[PDB]
Each structure stands twice: as structure tokens, then as C-alpha cells.
């Protein structure tokens, strides 16, 4: 493993196992090194694993990352913001990224 990748994966393990401050200390390092998208993924994961979807959503909509859009859609889904979710799915359906298309297709199925 490249060290920073290892640290990022461990931080994610941290956010899914109730070790949020440890994960944040790792993110503070990743932030210093410019891996801002990974920092945002760790923050979203930490907030969402704690059930704080509203805070996650507010922070996610204040920092733009195409690959993290699905996480914000998951926040809207869990909060039951139907209108916002539908709007987000229509926008994501416009993406050329096959991974985003797969996500949208999966969420549409989930919603049926």
C-alpha cells in the first residue's frame, strides 16, 4: 500500500466503527496533503454513519465532487427528501460515468 491510501482506508474503517476522532485526525493529514476529495468522503462517511444526514447534506452541497454525488443522494434518500432526491437523480442520469449511471439505475429500482 501507498501510505496515504492505507491511512485513507483506515480512516474509513474508523468512520464505520465509531472511531470518528481518529478518522478526523487522519483526514487532517490528508487535508494538509491536498487529498480534499478523500477528506470529504471521510467526513460524509463519519456524519452518515452517525445518522447525521442533514449535516452531511449541508457540507456536501458546499463542496463539489462529481464522484461523491451518490453519497448526497443517499443522504436525501435516508432523510426522506423525495423532491431533492428526484432532482438529483435526474441530474446524475446526465453523467457519462458508467458508475454514476449504475448508481442512478440502482436508486430508481430501490425507489419502486
Amino acid at each position: 500500500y501507498k501510505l496515504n491510501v492505507l491511512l485513507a482506508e483506515i480512516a474509513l474503517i474508523g468512520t464505520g466503527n465509531h472511531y470518528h476522532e481518529e478518522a478526523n485526525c487522519i483526514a487532517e493529514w490528508l487535508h494538509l496533503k491536498g487529498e480534499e476529495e478523500a477528506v470529504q468522503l471521510i467526513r460524509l462517511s463519519s456524519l452518515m454513519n452517525r445518522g447525521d444526514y442533514a449535516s452531511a447534506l449541508q457540507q456536501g452541497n458546499k463542496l463539489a465532487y462529481p464522484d461523491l454525488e451518490p453519497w448526497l443522494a443517499l443522504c436525501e434518500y435516508r432523510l426522506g427528501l423525495g423532491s431533492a432526491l428526484e432532482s438529483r437523480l435526474n441530474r446524475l442520469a446526465r453523467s457519462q460515468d458508467p458508475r454514476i449511471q449504475t448508481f442512478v439505475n440502482g436508486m430508481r429500482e430501490q425507489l419502486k
Partner: protein, 38 residues
């Protein structure tokens, strides 16, 4: 991915009540973000 991280991903379906298609796409986006590290 580290086994313990995959273990967490394997619980996303029940934790967030989402199907396997959603989980797989999110796991792929996550992996993609980590693959951008120099």
C-alpha cells in the same frame, strides 16, 4: 481494499437499506477516489 473496510461495505445494504447495485456502484466510486492518490 482492506478486509475490514470490505466488511463494512458488505453491511451498507442493511445499514442504509439499499440494494446491491447501489452498493457496488458506491464501492467502485470509493475505490476510484483512492486510486487517484499519487
Amino acid at each position: 481494499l482492506l478486509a475490514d473496510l470490505q466488511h463494512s461495505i458488505n453491511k451498507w445494504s442493511v445499514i442504509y437499506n439499499i440494494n446491491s447495485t447501489i452498493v457496488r456502484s458506491m464501492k467502485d466510486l470509493m475505490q476510484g477516489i483512492l486510486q487517484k492518490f499519487p
